[PDB]
Design a protein around this motif. Structure first.
Motif, mmCIF file in Angstrom:
data_model
loop_
_atom_site.group_PDB
_atom_site.id
_atom_site.type_symbol
_atom_site.label_atom_id
_atom_site.label_comp_id
_atom_site.label_asym_id
_atom_site.label_seq_id
_atom_site.Cartn_x
_atom_site.Cartn_y
_atom_site.Cartn_z
ATOM 1 N N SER A 190 -14.882 5.461 -0.394
ATOM 2 C CA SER A 190 -15.538 4.419 0.404
ATOM 3 C C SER A 190 -16.034 5.002 1.731
ATOM 4 C CB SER A 190 -14.567 3.263 0.685
ATOM 5 O OG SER A 190 -14.110 2.673 -0.520
ATOM 6 N N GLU A 208 -10.532 12.002 8.575
ATOM 7 C CA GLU A 208 -9.600 11.928 7.454
ATOM 8 C C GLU A 208 -8.217 12.407 7.908
ATOM 9 O OE1 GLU A 208 -9.272 10.754 4.448
ATOM 10 O OE2 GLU A 208 -7.347 11.780 4.196
ATOM 11 N N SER A 209 -7.183 11.663 7.535
ATOM 12 C CA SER A 209 -5.818 11.994 7.920
ATOM 13 C C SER A 209 -5.211 13.163 7.149
ATOM 14 C CB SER A 209 -4.924 10.766 7.752
ATOM 15 O OG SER A 209 -5.007 10.262 6.429
ATOM 16 N N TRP A 266 -7.864 8.677 -3.637
ATOM 17 C CA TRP A 266 -7.278 8.653 -4.977
ATOM 18 C C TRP A 266 -8.057 9.386 -6.068
ATOM 19 C CZ3 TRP A 266 -2.709 8.314 -3.783
ATOM 20 C CH2 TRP A 266 -2.234 7.388 -2.833
ATOM 21 N N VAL A 269 -5.865 8.898 12.426
ATOM 22 C CA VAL A 269 -6.248 8.076 13.570
ATOM 23 C C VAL A 269 -4.956 7.394 13.981
ATOM 24 C CG1 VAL A 269 -7.558 6.083 14.378
ATOM 25 C CG2 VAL A 269 -8.568 7.664 12.736
ATOM 26 N N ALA A 306 -11.217 -0.367 -0.994
ATOM 27 C CA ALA A 306 -10.452 -1.093 -2.009
ATOM 28 C C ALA A 306 -9.567 -2.247 -1.551
ATOM 29 C CB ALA A 306 -9.599 -0.094 -2.807
ATOM 30 N N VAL A 343 -11.364 -3.040 -6.215
ATOM 31 C CA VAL A 343 -10.680 -1.744 -6.242
ATOM 32 C C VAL A 343 -11.388 -0.652 -7.040
ATOM 33 C CG1 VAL A 343 -8.484 -2.971 -6.059
ATOM 34 C CG2 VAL A 343 -9.262 -2.153 -8.307
ATOM 35 N N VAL A 378 -13.985 2.139 -8.362
ATOM 36 C CA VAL A 378 -14.790 3.111 -7.634
ATOM 37 C C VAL A 378 -16.209 2.559 -7.401
ATOM 38 C CG1 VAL A 378 -15.828 5.416 -7.707
ATOM 39 C CG2 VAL A 378 -13.457 5.090 -8.430
HETATM 40 C C1 FAD Z 1 -4.011 6.284 -10.885
HETATM 41 C C2 FAD Z 1 -5.097 5.284 -10.614
HETATM 42 C C3 FAD Z 1 -6.109 5.161 -11.569
HETATM 43 C C4 FAD Z 1 -7.335 4.572 -11.229
HETATM 44 N N1 FAD Z 1 -8.327 4.464 -12.171
HETATM 45 C C5 FAD Z 1 -9.547 3.901 -11.848
HETATM 46 C C6 FAD Z 1 -10.531 3.833 -12.824
HETATM 47 O O1 FAD Z 1 -10.514 4.677 -13.721
HETATM 48 N N2 FAD Z 1 -11.742 3.266 -12.504
HETATM 49 C C7 FAD Z 1 -11.986 2.775 -11.240
HETATM 50 O O2 FAD Z 1 -13.081 2.275 -11.006
HETATM 51 N N3 FAD Z 1 -11.018 2.845 -10.263
HETATM 52 C C8 FAD Z 1 -9.785 3.417 -10.563
HETATM 53 N N4 FAD Z 1 -8.780 3.513 -9.606
HETATM 54 C C9 FAD Z 1 -8.904 2.733 -8.322
HETATM 55 C C10 FAD Z 1 -9.796 3.491 -7.347
HETATM 56 O O3 FAD Z 1 -9.684 4.879 -7.613
HETATM 57 C C11 FAD Z 1 -9.424 3.221 -5.887
HETATM 58 O O4 FAD Z 1 -9.402 1.835 -5.598
HETATM 59 C C12 FAD Z 1 -10.405 3.878 -4.915
HETATM 60 O O5 FAD Z 1 -10.564 5.252 -5.194
HETATM 61 C C13 FAD Z 1 -9.879 3.719 -3.500
HETATM 62 O O6 FAD Z 1 -10.838 4.255 -2.638
HETATM 63 P P1 FAD Z 1 -10.803 3.892 -1.090
HETATM 64 O O7 FAD Z 1 -11.841 4.687 -0.341
HETATM 65 O O8 FAD Z 1 -11.092 2.430 -0.895
HETATM 66 O O9 FAD Z 1 -9.298 4.239 -0.587
HETATM 67 P P2 FAD Z 1 -8.542 5.677 -0.612
HETATM 68 O O10 FAD Z 1 -8.970 6.536 -1.767
HETATM 69 O O11 FAD Z 1 -7.037 5.520 -0.652
HETATM 70 O O12 FAD Z 1 -9.003 6.421 0.738
HETATM 71 C C14 FAD Z 1 -8.535 6.022 2.006
HETATM 72 C C15 FAD Z 1 -8.375 7.294 2.828
HETATM 73 O O13 FAD Z 1 -8.117 6.998 4.189
HETATM 74 C C16 FAD Z 1 -7.223 7.971 4.686
HETATM 75 N N5 FAD Z 1 -6.506 7.544 5.906
HETATM 76 C C17 FAD Z 1 -5.400 6.723 6.002
HETATM 77 N N6 FAD Z 1 -5.062 6.603 7.312
HETATM 78 C C18 FAD Z 1 -5.929 7.338 8.051
HETATM 79 C C19 FAD Z 1 -6.044 7.572 9.423
HETATM 80 N N7 FAD Z 1 -5.265 6.929 10.282
HETATM 81 N N8 FAD Z 1 -7.062 8.387 9.890
HETATM 82 C C20 FAD Z 1 -7.959 8.974 9.018
HETATM 83 N N9 FAD Z 1 -7.835 8.737 7.660
HETATM 84 C C21 FAD Z 1 -6.842 7.935 7.181
HETATM 85 C C22 FAD Z 1 -6.314 8.319 3.522
HETATM 86 O O14 FAD Z 1 -5.861 9.645 3.614
HETATM 87 C C23 FAD Z 1 -7.224 8.154 2.321
HETATM 88 O O15 FAD Z 1 -7.710 9.406 1.885
HETATM 89 C C24 FAD Z 1 -7.564 4.099 -9.940
HETATM 90 C C25 FAD Z 1 -6.545 4.226 -9.000
HETATM 91 C C26 FAD Z 1 -5.325 4.820 -9.315
HETATM 92 C C27 FAD Z 1 -4.611 5.452 -8.150
#
Ligand code: FAD
Ligand code: ACJ
Length: 465
Positions: free
Chosen positions: A12, A33-34, A41, A248, A440, A445, A447
């Motif tokens: 995201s 990024e932390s 994920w 952060v 998410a 949630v 991708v």
């Molecule tokens: C095992 C599993 C299987 C999945 N399978 C699918 C599927 O096949 N199809 C599908 O569509 N989705 C799937 N998903 C769901 C999807 O992958 C996730 O919802 C999505 O990748 C989350 O992305 P995000 O950017 O919203 O959050 P995240 O990927 O969690 O990223 C948030 C980031 O912010 C960072 N962060 C936290 N605090 C700080 C800070 N203070 N300062 C700087 N950075 C910070 C973290 O390190 C993290 O890297 C799956 C999830 C799981 C875990």
């Protein structure tokens, strides 16, 4: 001059940073990024034998407007030659299973409806559904919604399993309005799910091929991580500042309404902040004056999931398909198993070996996390191996195993989730805070959803200047 800081380097955050940098007159962009890596994920491990083991998502569906937007992004990133599709003429695209009562049962595909473990209809169940009353509450749990309009069997065997396969969550606690928007709107608008779904998109070469070949899903040759990797490369190439290993620690407003993004022992000023980190985390970064927003955000929590990748040399599955789901009544801890090798044989390595991925979670993991029990790698490997042995007849010892406990990895949209989002949104606008939410924790949630939330955040932020 104008600076926009994006918190979180997950898909995201990467998508938001990407779209901001592509604008005609881009602002200065800083992605914080932390952890030591970007991608969140989405993570792929390249095994000793050359096989790919996915630790999170392992495929993306091209269906719908969002799936099309994602494929457009893939083309823009020049990832075409790396795309691995699962074409409509395969069993991994036409076969999903349910493990119930000691056996795997194929779920009805076409209009064929005489289907275990269900008692009798699926013709009949959907029949009385077209005449079922319309819920009058602003929200309802998936279970309640399901049992009320589809019956106990569909609720306990189908919807219960689906909530675990998509959200690794409990249908008795998840919102139908937030988790399955289409089913909710169908009922509210047309007054009938089926009746409503019957009444009822960019363009590119990949999108056209996806439709012509009826792709059910697609991934990338060297692993799905190639997607965030390509985004990162393009950002660094566009002059975007990427900070890794720098969590952060705080957010606060100051002179001329500019944000003060505080790091460990560093600081950054931002005219606008796009928060792409988990809601529970942002909740703690907010200043005292944003207490109401912090409270709305803290109400959004996520469940953990333990991913166990198992490889077997010279073994075969009982049936060919995408994988199978496990109802909570069968095993709270085993959410399901994905048959990776059926969908992507090219990632089996050499010598090739059968690969499956067991997803563990549910009340089993939750109760253990809440307990003093040490969540060892041994415990997860054992439960996964036993699940594969019992559910797939794979009594052989795995030749390779990977275990990863993902803490609070899937946000849970429980009852009232819509009002948590509404409250946060109204507080932001009412106080005119230069902060935008993405990821998410909010509008989906998947991708595809996360990428779209990043793009939408970029659009709203670029509009303002
Ligand atoms: C095992 C599993 C299987 C999945 N399978 C699918 C599927 O096949 N199809 C599908 O569509 N989705 C799937 N998903 C769901 C999807 O992958 C996730 O919802 C999505 O990748 C989350 O992305 P995000 O950017 O919203 O959050 P995240 O990927 O969690 O990223 C948030 C980031 O912010 C960072 N962060 C936290 N605090 C700080 C800070 N203070 N300062 C700087 N950075 C910070 C973290 O390190 C993290 O890297 C799956 C999830 C799981 C875990
Ligand atoms: O996509 C599914 O619904 C599906 C997921 C499976 O495995 C998971 C993948 C991801 C997650 C997640 F996202 F919740 F972590 C849970 C599970 Cl059980 C297994 C089988 C299926 N299926 O349709 O036959």
């Amino acid at each position: 001059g104008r600076t926009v800081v994006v918190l979180g380097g997950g898909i995201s955050g990467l998508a938001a940073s990407y779209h901001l940098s592509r604008a005609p007159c881009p602002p200065k962009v800083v992605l914080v990024e932390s952890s030591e890596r970007l991608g969140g994920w989405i993570r792929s491990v390249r095994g000793p034998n050359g096989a790919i083991f996915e630790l999170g998502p392992r495929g993306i569906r091209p269906a719908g407007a969002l799936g099309a937007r994602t494929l457009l992004l893939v083309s823009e990133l020049g990832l075409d030659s790396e795309v691995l599709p699962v074409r409509g003429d395969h069993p991994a695209a036409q076969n999903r299973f349910l493990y119930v009562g000691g056996a795997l049962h194929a779920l009805p595909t076409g209009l064929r409806g005489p289907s275990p473990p269900f008692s009798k209809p699926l013709f009949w169940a959907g029949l009385r559904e077209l005449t079922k009353p319309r819920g009058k509450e602003p929200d309802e749990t998936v279970h309640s919604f399901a049992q009320r309009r589809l019956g106990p069997e569909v609720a306990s065997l189908a919807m219960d399993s689906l909530c675990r396969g998509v959200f690794a969550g409990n249908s008795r606690e998840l919102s139908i309005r937030s988790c399955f928007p289409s089913l909710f709107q169908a009922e509210q608008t047309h007054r009938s799910i089926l009746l409503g779904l019957l009444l009822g998109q960019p363009d590119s070469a990949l999108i056209r091929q996806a439709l012509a070949e009826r792709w059910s899903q697609w991934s990338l040759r060297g692993g799905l991580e190639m997607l965030p990797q390509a985004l990162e490369t393009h950002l660094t190439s566009r002059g975007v500042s990427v900070l890794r290993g720098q969590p952060v620690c705080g957010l606060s407003l100051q002179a001329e309404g500019r944000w003060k993004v505080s790091l460990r022992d560093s600081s950054l000023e931002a005219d606008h902040v796009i928060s792409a980190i988990p809601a529970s985390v942002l909740s703690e970064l907010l200043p005292a004056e944003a207490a109401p927003l912090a409270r709305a955000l803290s109400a959004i929590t996520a469940v953990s999931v333990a991913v166990v990748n198992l490889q077997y040399q010279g073994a075969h599955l009982p049936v060919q398909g995408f994988g199978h789901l496990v109802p909570s009544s069968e095993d709270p801890g085993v959410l399901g198993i994905v048959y990776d090798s059926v969908a992507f044989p090219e990632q089996d390595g050499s010598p090739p070996g059968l690969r499956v991925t067991v997803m563990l979670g549910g009340s089993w993991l939750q109760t253990l996390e809440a307990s003093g029990c040490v969540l060892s790698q041994e415990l997860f490997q054992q439960r996964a191996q036993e699940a594969a042995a019992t559910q797939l007849g794979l009594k052989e010892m795995p030749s390779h195993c990977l275990v990863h406990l993902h803490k609070n990895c899937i946000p849970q949209y429980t009852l009232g989730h819509w009002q948590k989002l509404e409250s946060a949104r109204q507080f932001l606008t009412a106080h005119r805070l230069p902060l935008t939410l993405a990821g998410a924790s909010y509008e989906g949630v998947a991708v595809n959803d996360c990428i779209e939330s990043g793009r939408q955040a970029a659009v709203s932020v670029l509009g303002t200047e």
